[PDB]
Design an enzyme around this catalytic site. Structure first.
Site, PDB file in Angstrom:
ATOM      1  N   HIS A  71       0.834  -1.202   0.000  1.00 50.75           N
ATOM      2  CA  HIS A  71       0.000   0.000   0.000  1.00 50.75           C
ATOM      3  C   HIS A  71       0.858   1.237   0.000  1.00 50.75           C
ATOM      4  CE1 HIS A  71      -3.215   2.721   0.596  1.00 50.75           C
ATOM      5  NE2 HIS A  71      -3.020   2.921   1.887  1.00 50.75           N
ATOM      6  N   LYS A 126     -15.835  -7.376  -7.600  1.00 50.03           N
ATOM      7  CA  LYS A 126     -15.003  -8.222  -8.452  1.00 50.03           C
ATOM      8  C   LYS A 126     -14.338  -9.337  -7.653  1.00 50.03           C
ATOM      9  CE  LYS A 126     -12.123  -7.459 -12.531  1.00 50.03           C
ATOM     10  NZ  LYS A 126     -11.448  -6.417 -13.351  1.00 50.03           N
ATOM     11  N   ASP A 127     -13.870  -9.024  -6.442  1.00 52.03           N
ATOM     12  CA  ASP A 127     -13.300 -10.040  -5.568  1.00 52.03           C
ATOM     13  C   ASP A 127     -14.364 -11.006  -5.078  1.00 52.03           C
ATOM     14  OD1 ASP A 127     -10.898  -8.787  -5.964  1.00 52.03           O
ATOM     15  OD2 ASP A 127     -10.438  -8.524  -3.837  1.00 52.03           O
ATOM     16  N   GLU A 130       3.218 -34.428  -4.103  1.00 56.59           N
ATOM     17  CA  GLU A 130       1.947 -33.999  -4.629  1.00 56.59           C
ATOM     18  C   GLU A 130       2.245 -33.149  -5.834  1.00 56.59           C
ATOM     19  OE1 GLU A 130      -0.354 -32.879  -1.360  1.00 56.59           O
ATOM     20  OE2 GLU A 130      -2.254 -32.701  -2.437  1.00 56.59           O
ATOM     21  N   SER A 132      -0.911  -0.889  -6.097  1.00 52.50           N
ATOM     22  CA  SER A 132      -0.809  -2.043  -6.980  1.00 52.50           C
ATOM     23  C   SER A 132      -0.362  -1.652  -8.376  1.00 52.50           C
ATOM     24  CB  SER A 132      -2.144  -2.769  -7.048  1.00 52.50           C
ATOM     25  OG  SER A 132      -2.547  -3.202  -5.765  1.00 52.50           O
TER      26      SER A 132
HETATM   27  C1  HEM Z   1       0.125 -16.230   1.010  1.00 53.74           C
HETATM   28  C2  HEM Z   1      -0.095 -16.155  -0.298  1.00 53.74           C
HETATM   29  C3  HEM Z   1      -0.280 -14.835  -0.918  1.00 53.74           C
HETATM   30  C4  HEM Z   1      -1.358 -14.020  -0.810  1.00 53.74           C
HETATM   31  C5  HEM Z   1      -2.619 -14.251  -0.027  1.00 53.74           C
HETATM   32  C6  HEM Z   1      -1.083 -12.871  -1.576  1.00 53.74           C
HETATM   33  C7  HEM Z   1      -2.030 -11.871  -1.699  1.00 53.74           C
HETATM   34  C8  HEM Z   1      -1.781 -10.708  -2.386  1.00 53.74           C
HETATM   35  C9  HEM Z   1      -2.707  -9.669  -2.568  1.00 53.74           C
HETATM   36  C10 HEM Z   1      -4.115  -9.629  -2.047  1.00 53.74           C
HETATM   37  C11 HEM Z   1      -2.095  -8.708  -3.293  1.00 53.74           C
HETATM   38  C12 HEM Z   1      -2.688  -7.404  -3.746  1.00 53.74           C
HETATM   39  C13 HEM Z   1      -2.856  -7.464  -5.260  1.00 53.74           C
HETATM   40  C14 HEM Z   1      -4.305  -7.661  -5.592  1.00 53.74           C
HETATM   41  O1  HEM Z   1      -5.015  -8.408  -4.889  1.00 53.74           O
HETATM   42  O2  HEM Z   1      -4.790  -7.081  -6.584  1.00 53.74           O
HETATM   43  C15 HEM Z   1      -0.795  -9.148  -3.576  1.00 53.74           C
HETATM   44  C16 HEM Z   1       0.113  -8.424  -4.299  1.00 53.74           C
HETATM   45  C17 HEM Z   1       1.365  -8.934  -4.584  1.00 53.74           C
HETATM   46  N1  HEM Z   1       1.885 -10.125  -4.276  1.00 53.74           N
HETATM   47 FE1  HEM Z   1       0.999 -11.477  -3.349  1.00 53.74          FE
HETATM   48  N2  HEM Z   1       0.117 -12.956  -2.145  1.00 53.74           N
HETATM   49  C18 HEM Z   1       0.671 -14.119  -1.793  1.00 53.74           C
HETATM   50  C19 HEM Z   1       1.892 -14.653  -2.163  1.00 53.74           C
HETATM   51  C20 HEM Z   1       2.822 -13.966  -2.917  1.00 53.74           C
HETATM   52  C21 HEM Z   1       4.062 -14.466  -3.319  1.00 53.74           C
HETATM   53  C22 HEM Z   1       4.594 -15.837  -3.025  1.00 53.74           C
HETATM   54  C23 HEM Z   1       4.685 -13.472  -4.039  1.00 53.74           C
HETATM   55  C24 HEM Z   1       6.011 -13.544  -4.664  1.00 53.74           C
HETATM   56  C25 HEM Z   1       6.274 -14.469  -5.576  1.00 53.74           C
HETATM   57  C26 HEM Z   1       3.809 -12.360  -4.066  1.00 53.74           C
HETATM   58  C27 HEM Z   1       4.076 -11.173  -4.689  1.00 53.74           C
HETATM   59  C28 HEM Z   1       3.135 -10.152  -4.754  1.00 53.74           C
HETATM   60  C29 HEM Z   1       3.439  -8.889  -5.422  1.00 53.74           C
HETATM   61  C30 HEM Z   1       4.729  -8.513  -6.093  1.00 53.74           C
HETATM   62  C31 HEM Z   1       2.343  -8.132  -5.306  1.00 53.74           C
HETATM   63  C32 HEM Z   1       2.123  -6.749  -5.836  1.00 53.74           C
HETATM   64  C33 HEM Z   1       1.473  -6.937  -7.206  1.00 53.74           C
HETATM   65  C34 HEM Z   1       0.353  -5.951  -7.410  1.00 53.74           C
HETATM   66  O3  HEM Z   1      -0.537  -5.824  -6.542  1.00 53.74           O
HETATM   67  O4  HEM Z   1       0.304  -5.270  -8.457  1.00 53.74           O
HETATM   68  N3  HEM Z   1       2.690 -12.687  -3.358  1.00 53.74           N
HETATM   69  N4  HEM Z   1      -0.607 -10.367  -2.991  1.00 53.74           N
HETATM   70  C1  HEM Z   2      -3.875 -22.857  11.441  1.00 52.36           C
HETATM   71  C2  HEM Z   2      -4.153 -23.301  10.224  1.00 52.36           C
HETATM   72  C3  HEM Z   2      -4.183 -24.743   9.938  1.00 52.36           C
HETATM   73  C4  HEM Z   2      -4.581 -25.786  10.761  1.00 52.36           C
HETATM   74  C5  HEM Z   2      -5.051 -25.681  12.187  1.00 52.36           C
HETATM   75  C6  HEM Z   2      -4.473 -27.035  10.060  1.00 52.36           C
HETATM   76  C7  HEM Z   2      -4.793 -28.288  10.634  1.00 52.36           C
HETATM   77  C8  HEM Z   2      -4.656 -29.506   9.970  1.00 52.36           C
HETATM   78  C9  HEM Z   2      -4.832 -30.802  10.520  1.00 52.36           C
HETATM   79  C10 HEM Z   2      -5.206 -31.131  11.941  1.00 52.36           C
HETATM   80  C11 HEM Z   2      -4.603 -31.722   9.545  1.00 52.36           C
HETATM   81  C12 HEM Z   2      -4.667 -33.221   9.681  1.00 52.36           C
HETATM   82  C13 HEM Z   2      -6.073 -33.739   9.375  1.00 52.36           C
HETATM   83  C14 HEM Z   2      -6.120 -34.324   7.989  1.00 52.36           C
HETATM   84  O1  HEM Z   2      -5.074 -34.416   7.308  1.00 52.36           O
HETATM   85  O2  HEM Z   2      -7.209 -34.727   7.523  1.00 52.36           O
HETATM   86  C15 HEM Z   2      -4.275 -31.014   8.379  1.00 52.36           C
HETATM   87  C16 HEM Z   2      -3.982 -31.627   7.189  1.00 52.36           C
HETATM   88  C17 HEM Z   2      -3.499 -30.893   6.124  1.00 52.36           C
HETATM   89  N1  HEM Z   2      -3.316 -29.568   6.032  1.00 52.36           N
HETATM   90 FE1  HEM Z   2      -3.683 -28.298   7.362  1.00 52.36          FE
HETATM   91  N2  HEM Z   2      -4.027 -26.804   8.826  1.00 52.36           N
HETATM   92  C18 HEM Z   2      -3.848 -25.465   8.682  1.00 52.36           C
HETATM   93  C19 HEM Z   2      -3.413 -24.762   7.575  1.00 52.36           C
HETATM   94  C20 HEM Z   2      -3.013 -25.394   6.423  1.00 52.36           C
HETATM   95  C21 HEM Z   2      -2.442 -24.732   5.345  1.00 52.36           C
HETATM   96  C22 HEM Z   2      -2.167 -23.257   5.266  1.00 52.36           C
HETATM   97  C23 HEM Z   2      -2.180 -25.684   4.390  1.00 52.36           C
HETATM   98  C24 HEM Z   2      -1.566 -25.443   3.087  1.00 52.36           C
HETATM   99  C25 HEM Z   2      -0.313 -25.014   3.053  1.00 52.36           C
HETATM  100  C26 HEM Z   2      -2.596 -26.934   4.897  1.00 52.36           C
HETATM  101  C27 HEM Z   2      -2.490 -28.116   4.222  1.00 52.36           C
HETATM  102  C28 HEM Z   2      -2.840 -29.327   4.806  1.00 52.36           C
HETATM  103  C29 HEM Z   2      -2.689 -30.574   4.059  1.00 52.36           C
HETATM  104  C30 HEM Z   2      -2.176 -30.727   2.654  1.00 52.36           C
HETATM  105  C31 HEM Z   2      -3.100 -31.548   4.877  1.00 52.36           C
HETATM  106  C32 HEM Z   2      -3.148 -33.018   4.570  1.00 52.36           C
HETATM  107  C33 HEM Z   2      -4.412 -33.285   3.757  1.00 52.36           C
HETATM  108  C34 HEM Z   2      -4.596 -34.763   3.558  1.00 52.36           C
HETATM  109  O3  HEM Z   2      -4.731 -35.514   4.548  1.00 52.36           O
HETATM  110  O4  HEM Z   2      -4.617 -35.238   2.402  1.00 52.36           O
HETATM  111  N3  HEM Z   2      -3.137 -26.720   6.129  1.00 52.36           N
HETATM  112  N4  HEM Z   2      -4.333 -29.659   8.647  1.00 52.36           N
END
Ligand code: HEM
Ligand code: HEM
Ligand SMILES: CCCCCCCCCCCCCCCCCC(=O)OC[C@H](COP(=O)([O-])OCC(O)COP(=O)([O-])OC[C@@H](COC(=O)CCCCCCCCCCCCCCCCC)OC(=O)CCCCCCCCCCCCCCCCC)OC(=O)CCCCCCCCCCCCCCCCC
Ligand SMILES: CCCCCCCCCCCCCCCCCC(=O)OC[C@H](COP(=O)([O-])OCC(O)COP(=O)([O-])OC[C@@H](COC(=O)CCCCCCCCCCCCCCCCC)OC(=O)CCCCCCCCCCCCCCCCC)OC(=O)CCCCCCCCCCCCCCCCC
Ligand SMILES: CCCCCCCCCCCCCCCCCC(=O)OC[C@H](COP(=O)([O-])OCC(O)COP(=O)([O-])OC[C@@H](COC(=O)CCCCCCCCCCCCCCCCC)OC(=O)CCCCCCCCCCCCCCCCC)OC(=O)CCCCCCCCCCCCCCCCC
Ligand SMILES: CCCCCCCCCCCCCCCCCC(=O)OC[C@H](COP(=O)(O)OCCN)OC(=O)CCCCCCCCCCCCCCCCC
Ligand SMILES: CCCCCCCCCCCCCCCCCC(=O)OC[C@H](COP(=O)(O)O)OC(=O)CCCCCCCCCCCCCCCCC
Ligand code: HEM
Ligand SMILES: COc1c(O)c(C)c(C/C=C(\C)CC/C=C(\C)CC/C=C(/C)CC/C=C(\C)CC/C=C(\C)CCC=C(C)C)c(O)c1OC
Ligand SMILES: COc1c(O)c(C)c(C/C=C(\C)CC/C=C(\C)CC/C=C(/C)CC/C=C(\C)CC/C=C(\C)CCC=C(C)C)c(O)c1OC
Lengths: 98, 139, 373, 66, 76, 55, 22, 48, 54, 238, 35, 184
Positions: free
Chosen positions: C194, C220-221, C264, C198
């Site tokens: 911000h 839009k979102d 995966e 953007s």
């Molecule tokens: C946790 C996963 C992520 C979320 C939820 C996220 C979410 C967002 C959001 C909401 C924006 C504002 C842009 C829009 O919505 O129009 C944004 C911008 C951006 N994100 Fe991410 N992002 C994530 C991961 C990443 C990663 C991994 C990268 C780097 C590879 C990245 C790079 C950027 C950049 C450079 C911007 C500015 C682009 C722009 O708004 O024009 N983000 N991100």
């Molecule tokens: C605080 C946030 C989160 C909590 C409390 C949570 C909790 C759990 C728990 C208890 C399990 C085991 C139960 C199961 O596998 O059926 C699980 C599985 C999993 N979670 Fe999460 N989780 C969280 C966020 C996330 C996020 C951010 C991701 C992605 C990066 C993720 C990806 C997975 C995956 C891939 C599995 C295995 C699914 C499968 O069994 O095939 N979780 N999560």
């Protein structure tokens, strides 16, 4: 080379939005200093062209073909002003090393 | 020559890579020959200009070779039916379209599609029915 | 009001570019996916037990006896898959439109990407199937690469000689705790953005044409959220097992090993690279660089135009990069045998050469064509 | 009682595509007969034949099945 | 924030109320032409690469199988 | 194997031929120079841990 | 001045007592 | 109908009342209608 | 469908296909060198037609 | 290198197509009379059946038909009682090793999630159970083995368990080997996903709700975005 | 250039000192006996 | 840096009264205690199992077999006690010196106090001792007092007829997740 440059100018596609080449430059510090040194009329035309291009990109449209920017016609207005910014910038830099 | 023939040996729809390569070559060969006649007669203005035309004709022809090969092979692949004039027609259909594009004309694509595809289809039928072209005199 | 001041500043009266396409939806989708994951994860945590005797039994109890527990579990799994789909498209938007020049936002992004990959890895270990156990061992022994620091570190995470209950329980604790750190890092991500606003698909200064966000990029979102919910549910309620693996439905047998083991889908591109490099260490490093090369990306921008809307040669190189990323995703799946290996080796060479070498040279050539260089 | 599969199998089986496939397998079977003192087997031939047969049967076993 | 974003001059901007204008003016009327206009403008820069991907994919799969295929001369 | 220490404890018996070939193996040419007997108190008896050096 | 031109036509946009319904 | 706007859309409060009430009944109708479909699609296979 | 589409497709197109084909084949410089070289090309192709089908 | 089971036209193969519950009932009978001697449906309890293919009281009957021990007693360990609706299916070979021994080294794999755990399970299952064909030339299966072109390695310890008319279906549907393999594949499928039917109903409601809601939200977005999409800009330098 | 060279030469001694602190710190913290 | 500004706006260049006594330390102590609890809680979560057969066994395994696990467990328990000591003195400072006229700060405070009490209650249920189980039943029963929807609510929370494994596991999840909401 001249015809292939015209073909690449058509392939770049900013002429279809009515933009010039110098409108498409990324505004770094030197580019913003060159933009600030522009006269008022050139700056106003540049801002209107950028706003129109943004509106056309919003509606996913382009200009009609008669309104596109002819490669030959495009004017490199910011260029003269930019060179100076770079020249001045470099001079200060070398002097730093002194 | 053992090469081109290979196209036919492997069942259609299979080994598309070879098919496309072979088809591309034939088109390209025709391109060269076609450009040659086009340059020998109706000559160019400068050597370069003519080298370009050779290239243009060669590529366009090579393209119409590729898409024909690719489309027919894949159409057969996806459709799973190896022996079907339709596969080829789709291919010829595509080939014509490439020609149309290279010539920047929708209309040409029209005639191109129909005429070219029909021709290719007939080739398939020809092979399927064992039609003989340029036959030896057997009276 | 202090809060409303903040609220009005990041979501209502925020000046946004008027011409940003649907790709700019994706990051907001990621945030929604994060909340969805957290919510579903919380409702998995009220019945899951992190004990190696009872983890598979607790997962089956969730699927069979808890009311709509199968729904929450498969929503969690396919929401992790949807998270990685939206993450890859978000990163691809950032690479294509030159958004990496927001360097702090990009670096907080690649930190978020590392955290999300670690969270998904430990979460996939959590159900304690056959595939989870062999995947953990394999991916952890990878850490055993480091000569002096590595071995001990591995057993340190394994908490013992080999992954066993010691691991499962600490992996449950980490996997629980890291998405809240991801949420805090996402708040830092939004702040560092911000300050700059953007970017737009033309890559130009959009200060002359900015509109509010409440009525224009909110609905839009909301529409993007609705479409993403359509795809997730239709990937849970109709094709629930499409993205998963069948061997994870067997209990974890240390004596046997699933014959065909694969990460995966999302972790494959990396898998391919790792397998490609002959040296173990080399693989680990390249693997890391695979993700890190992105961070390195803002220092490789040699063009005077920010976006790729007016840059066709670098557009071709970008789509070749997307192409061999898909190729590396396919290779990872393929087993170790000719000619999958060679493709993997080339595809990795082409990936690193396009990102490192070909795009700045192409940008120099494109600047030369416009009489700028 | 006659298992529907047998019927469906017979049908797809009679097909020449399959017949020659089986024959190729036969040549393979025979090869191993004469070439008895080797390690070459006919497993691969077996599978390809079956894949064809089953694919077809599978195309048409459920209809008969009740 | 708004008010201090940029400096423009003499750019008049007309607009209409949402309820006063048709919701989908000529949606399929020009939408189709435009969508088609758009694709032809990037198709040559997007598809070509992925085409080759389909190709490598196919060649790769077939080649592998052939490798598995028993060598006729093998054992004979 | 008896899953000793949470890892497959491979315990194997070898044949005259088995024992004969392993000795024939070129220790120096081995990726890892360790002659068969070097890892076994009994040629007829070989004991190994089942963790691929790789992953 | 400000009267040289008139508001551009929105007929392809404008729809064709009605407000309440609209 | 201009009665709608005056009775349902005009005052936010009224705009709401209609939504909530409609939703209250919509579920009944949707579930009923949807179930009819689902069942018929697989009329034969269901406990009864 | 009558008049334009069924007259542009079958009756007229065949009219055009040929017309255009005659225009390219009959637009000849009249110079002997050009023509002759075409004889050269022919000899070359026929030499090959025999060669490859030896 | 493994034979890849073909695609069969299952009655639940379609996008909204539920399971045939008579086939699940017949396949449960097939498991109870044949497959329960070696395999253990650990995660399926009698109660689970109620609502799918057996009614509450009906299930009670089945439950009452098994002896399940109650370990904790004032002074004793086991007076296996009439299994209840809360009891889980009785696993043969209380200890894994026991079966190992009985099956000659093999460990029948618990068939609760077999269909989900086996790639292309439903097909695989059908194929394996029906793929007991003749071993080819050169093959030398070890003692106590059989030949199935699908099973990994084509050497499954399991002997062919379905001989035509192996068991009689109570419904009377001819008990042909196939009719039995298809029923047990449907049942095992049900086992690996008791919610298959309920879900598909949720998916149908989801498709109807998204078909209602996507054009309406698109219309609201295009209302609130028409204003700009009609905005006409004009540059009027003085 | 020359000026930056003077700067480096002037700060590198300080930098070395900082690295030295880190050496003691890292080693002491790692309890690496080799040191 | 944009982030640095936040630091220099809340911890470095913040204008504070020169004459505030040691009582004004206590709130910062609470924040430190929160981190300490979270850190110790994380190191309890790598070995604790939320199963009624194994919860007491896991707690004894933490105290007896994990290296310095008794230290982290008793630091967690006495840090909860220290949290409530600092909380009571913070509230007493707010009552004595008229700090409740900062009304929004006071209301966010009493919300934090409710959240901390709920977190400590479910955390005390978590080791599954004799006292934890009878304590849980008691307060869960408190809810039943509700005039009309009480019974349902109690059963909901319990997740069954009476507190049993169903409760323990959801209490582990809620006790894990609420201190991050407390931090926000
Ligand atoms: C946790 C996963 C992520 C979320 C939820 C996220 C979410 C967002 C959001 C909401 C924006 C504002 C842009 C829009 O919505 O129009 C944004 C911008 C951006 N994100 Fe991410 N992002 C994530 C991961 C990443 C990663 C991994 C990268 C780097 C590879 C990245 C790079 C950027 C950049 C450079 C911007 C500015 C682009 C722009 O708004 O024009 N983000 N991100
Ligand atoms: C605080 C946030 C989160 C909590 C409390 C949570 C909790 C759990 C728990 C208890 C399990 C085991 C139960 C199961 O596998 O059926 C699980 C599985 C999993 N979670 Fe999460 N989780 C969280 C966020 C996330 C996020 C951010 C991701 C992605 C990066 C993720 C990806 C997975 C995956 C891939 C599995 C295995 C699914 C499968 O069994 O095939 N979780 N999560
Ligand atoms: C049944 C009914 C079906 C109805 C379908 C729908 C019909 C819709 C209505 C009809 C319509 O819309 O037509 C409009 C369309 C409008 O065209 P136009 O505006 O008059 O200009 C196009 C003329 O061709 C222009 O010719 P030009 O005389 O003015 O020459 C100038 C031309 C000169 O061309 C160029 O300089 C550019 C390069 C063009 C050729 C490049 C490739 C050359 C090699 C041959 C093609 C590749 C073969 C590869 C084979 C691979 C095999 C593996 O420069 C151009 O830029 C135009 C390119 C024209 C390309 C076609 C003519 C050359 C190709 C054929 C050569 C062989 C025959 C002649 C000897 O009508 C035509 O004139 C059609 C022209 C001929 C098309 C032939 C297509 C292939 C036919 C294959 C038959 C079977 C072969 C086996
Ligand atoms: C072609 C047939 C449709 C047509 O002729 O309409 C012309 C129209 C193109 O008109 P235009 O004046 O060239 O472009 C202006 C936009 O349509 C202005 O409206 P819009 O289309 O940008 O609407 C907002 C946008 C907002 O899009 C999003 O929010 C996407 C959010 C991310 C994707 C979903 C998340 C999960 C992604 C997993 C991968 O919604 C979409 O883009 C929907 C795309 C649907 C593609 C067609 C298949 C259905 O095509 C569409 O509107 C496509 C959407 C409706 C179909
Ligand atoms: C059980 C409760 C557990 C509480 C744990 C956290 C206690 C935090 C105390 C922080 C603190 O006392 O430091 C500021 C305070 C600032 O130093 P100062 O300017 O000399 O303060 C003099 C008076 O304490 C300045 O006194 P004041 O007028 O600022 O207020 C009295 C002071 C407590 O002092 C008292 O006179 C009442 C003690 C009861 O306030 C409290 O500490 C309340 C403690 C309630 C227990 O440092 C101390 O009071 C302790 C000095 C230790 C020196 C050790 C030398 C070796
Ligand atoms: C996918 C293909 C989408 C598509 O339609 O391609 C053409 C489109 C052209 O976009 P552009 O040149 O900006 O022109 C916009 C004109 N209104 O192309 C675009 O819309 C731009 C798309 C940019 C982001 C593409 C992301 C693709 C997936 C990349 C994943 C991997 C990224 C690296 C991960 C590590
Ligand atoms: C905005 C998007 C809101 C969510 C999606 C809305 C459209 C689908 C609504 C449900 C349609 C349906 O199938 O109803 C019956 C169905 C229940 O079946 P019934 O009980 O037999 O009526 O409802 C569901 O689909 C349950 C799952 C809904 C999940 C929606 C996706 C977002 C989850 C976010 C979690 C946090
Ligand atoms: C997210 C951070 C936290 C985690 C992960 C966590 C985790 C745990 C775990 C696993 C236990 C069971 C082991 C034990 O008996 O101590 C526990 C117990 C406990 N926790 Fe927490 N906790 C956290 C925050 C807190 C906070 C902030 C408080 C204070 C309000 C608290 C108070 C307690 C208490 C009183 C016990 C019981 C101590 C006992 O056994 O006597 N916890 N916690
Ligand atoms: C126009 O530019 C912007 C923009 O400036 C901002 C702030 C957001 C942020 C708005 C959102 C709805 C995304 C929310 C972001 C998160 C990181 C969610 C975090 C989730 C937590 C649980 C924390 C955008 O989505 C956006 O483009 C549409
Ligand atoms: C003058 O008024 C102030 C003041 O404005 C601030 C910011 C602080 C600083 C506050 C802290 C250091 C406590 C921070 C509170 C937390 C809960 C830290 C975050 C903890 C997490 C677990 C997150 C004071 O101590 C203080 O009084 C002297």
């Amino acid at each position: 080379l001249d015809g292939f440059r015209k073909w690449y100018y058509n392939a770049a596609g900013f002429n279809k939005l009515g933009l010039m080449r110098d409108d498409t430059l990324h505004e770094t510090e030197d580019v913003k200093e060159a933009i600030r040194r522009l006269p008022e009329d050139l700056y106003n035309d540049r801002m209107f062209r950028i706003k129109r291009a943004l509106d056309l990109t919003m509606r996913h449209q382009i200009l009609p073909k008669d309104q596109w920017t002819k490669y030959e016609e495009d004017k490199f207005y910011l260029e003269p002003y930019l060179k100076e910014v770079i020249r001045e910038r470099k001079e200060r830099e070398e002097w730093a090393k002194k | 020559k053992r090469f081109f023939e290979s196209y036919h040996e492997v069942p259609d729809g299979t080994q598309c890579h070879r098919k496309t390569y072979i088809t591309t070559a034939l088109g390209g060969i025709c391109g060269i020959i076609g450009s040659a006649y086009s340059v020998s007669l109706n000559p160019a203005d400068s050597t370069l200009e003519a080298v370009a035309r050779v290239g243009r004709y060669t590529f366009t022809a090579a393209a119409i070779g590729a898409m024909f090969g690719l489309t027919t092979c894949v159409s057969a692949q996806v459709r799973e039916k190896p022996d079907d004039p339709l596969n080829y027609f789709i291919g010829g259909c595509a080939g014509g379209l490439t020609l149309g594009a290279r010539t920047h004309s929708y209309g040409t694509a029209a005639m191109g599609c129909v005429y070219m595809g029909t021709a290719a289809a007939l080739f398939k039928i020809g092979k399927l029915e064992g039609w003989e072209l340029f036959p030896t005199p057997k009276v | 009001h202090p809060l409303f001041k903040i609220i009005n500043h990041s979501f209502i009266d925020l000046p946004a570019p008027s011409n940003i396409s649907s790709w700019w939806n994706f990051g907001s989708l990621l945030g929604v996916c994060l909340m969805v994951q957290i919510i579903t994860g919380l409702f998995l945590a009220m019945h899951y037990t992190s004990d190696t005797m009872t983890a598979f039994s607790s997962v089956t109890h969730i699927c069979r006896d808890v009311n709509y527990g199968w729904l929450i579990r498969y929503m969690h799994a396919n929401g992790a898959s949807m998270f990685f789909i939206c993450l890859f498209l978000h990163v691809g938007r950032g690479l294509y439109y030159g958004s990496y020049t927001f360097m702090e936002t990009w670096n907080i992004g690649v930190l978020l990407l590392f955290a999300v990959m670690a969270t998904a890895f430990m979460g996939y270990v959590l159900p304690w199937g056959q595939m989870s156990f062999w995947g953990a061992t394999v991916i952890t022994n990878l850490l055993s690469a480091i000569p002096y620091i590595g071995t001990t570190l591995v057993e340190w995470i394994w908490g013992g000689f080999s992954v066993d209950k010691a691991t499962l329980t600490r992996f449950f604790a980490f996997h629980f705790i890291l998405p809240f750190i991801i949420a805090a890092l996402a708040i830092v991500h939004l702040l560092f953005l911000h300050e700059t606003g953007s970017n737009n698909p033309t890559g130009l200064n959009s200060d002359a044409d900015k509109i509010p966000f409440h009525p224009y990029y909110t609905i839009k979102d909301i529409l993007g959220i609705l479409i993403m919910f359509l795809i997730l549910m239709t990937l849970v309620l109709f094709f629930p097992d499409m993205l998963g693996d069948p061997d994870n439905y067997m209990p974890a047998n240390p004596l046997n090993t699933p014959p065909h083991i694969k990460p995966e889908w999302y972790f494959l591109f990396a898998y391919a690279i790792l397998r490609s490099i002959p040296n173990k260490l080399g693989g680990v490093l390249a693997l890391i660089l695979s993700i890190l090369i992105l961070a390195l990306m803002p220092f490789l921008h040699t063009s005077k135009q920010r976006s790729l809307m007016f840059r066709p040669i670098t557009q071709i190189l970008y789509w070749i990069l997307v192409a061999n990323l898909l190729i590396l995703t396919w290779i990872g799946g393929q087993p170790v045998e000719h000619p999958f290996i060679i493709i993997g080796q080339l595809a990795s060479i082409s990936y690193f050469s396009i990102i490192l070498i070909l795009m700045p040279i192409s940008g120099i050539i494109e600047d030369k064509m416009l009489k700028l260089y | 009682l006659v298992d529907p599969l047998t019927t469906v199998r017979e049908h797809c089986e009679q097909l020449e595509k399959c017949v020659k496939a089986r024959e190729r397998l036969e040549l393979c079977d025979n090869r191993v007969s004469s070439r008895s003192q080797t390690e070459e087997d006919c497993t691969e031939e077996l599978f390809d034949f079956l894949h064809a047969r089953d694919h077809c049967v599978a195309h048409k076993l459920f209809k008969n099945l009740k | 924030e708004f008010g201090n974003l940029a400096r423009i001059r003499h750019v008049i901007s007309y607009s209409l109320s949402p309820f006063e204008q048709r919701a989908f003016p000529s949606y399929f009327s020009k939408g189709i032409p435009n969508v088609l206009r758009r694709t032809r403008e990037r198709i040559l820069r997007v598809a070509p690469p992925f085409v080759v991907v389909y190709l490598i994919y196919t060649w790769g799969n077939q080649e592998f199988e052939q490798s598995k295929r028993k060598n006729p001369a093998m054992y004979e | 194997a008896f899953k000793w220490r949470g890892k497959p404890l491979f315990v194997r018996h070898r044949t005259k031929k088995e024992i004969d070939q392993e000795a024939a193996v070129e220790v120096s040419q081995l990726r890892d120079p360790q002659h068969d007997l070097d890892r076994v108190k009994k040629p007829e008896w070989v004991i190994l841990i089942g963790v691929c050096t790789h992953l | 001045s400000h009267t040289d031109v008139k508001v551009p036509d929105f007929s392809d946009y404008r729809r064709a007592e009605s407000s309440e319904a609209r | 109908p201009s009665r709608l706007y005056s009775l349902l859309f005009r005052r936010t409060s009224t705009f709401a009342l209609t939504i909530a009430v409609g939703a209250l009944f919509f579920e009944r109708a949707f579930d009923q209608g949807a179930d009819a479909i689902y069942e018929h699609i697989n009329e034969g296979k269901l406990w009864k | 469908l009558d008049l334009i589409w069924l007259e542009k497709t079958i009756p007229k197109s065949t009219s055009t296909l040929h017309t255009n084909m005659t225009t390219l084949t009959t637009n000849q410089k009249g110079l002997i060198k050009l023509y002759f070289m075409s004889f050269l090309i022919n000899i070359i192709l026929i030499i090959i037609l025999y060669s490859i089908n030896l | 290198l493994e034979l890849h089971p073909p695609s069969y036209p299952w009655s639940h193969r379609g996008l909204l197509s539920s399971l045939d519950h008579t086939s699940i009932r017949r396949g449960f009978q097939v498991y109870k009379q044949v497959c329960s001697s070696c395999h253990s449906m650990d995660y399926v309890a009698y109660r689970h059946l109620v609502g799918v293919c057996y009614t509450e009281e009906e299930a009670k009957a089945l439950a009452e038909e098994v002896e399940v021990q109650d370990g904790p007693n004032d002074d004793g360990e086991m007076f296996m009682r009439p299994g209840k609706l809360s009891d889980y299916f009785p696993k043969p070979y209380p200890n894994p090793e026991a079966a190992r021994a009985a099956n000659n080294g093999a460990l029948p794999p618990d068939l609760s999630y077999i269909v989900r755990a086996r790639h292309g399970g439903e097909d695989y299952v059908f194929s394996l159970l029906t793929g007991y064909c003749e071993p080819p030339t050169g093959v030398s299966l070890r003692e106590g083995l059989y030949f199935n072109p699908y099973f990994p390695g084509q050497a499954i310890g399991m002997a062919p368990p379905i001989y035509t008319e192996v068991l009689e279906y109570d419904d009377g549907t001819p008990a042909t080997m196939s009719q039995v393999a298809k029923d047990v594949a449907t049942f095992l499928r049900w086992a690996s996903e008791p919610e298959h039917d309920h879900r598909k109903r949720m998916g149908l409601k989801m498709l109807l709700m998204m078909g209602l809601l996507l054009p309406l939200t698109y219309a609201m977005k295009r209302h609130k975005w028409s204003v700009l999409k009609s905005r006409k800009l004009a540059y009027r330098p003085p | 250039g020359p000026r930056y060279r003077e700067l480096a030469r002037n700060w590198i001694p300080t930098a070395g000192m900082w690295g030295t602190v880190g050496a003691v710190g890292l080693v002491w913290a790692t309890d690496w006996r080799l040191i």
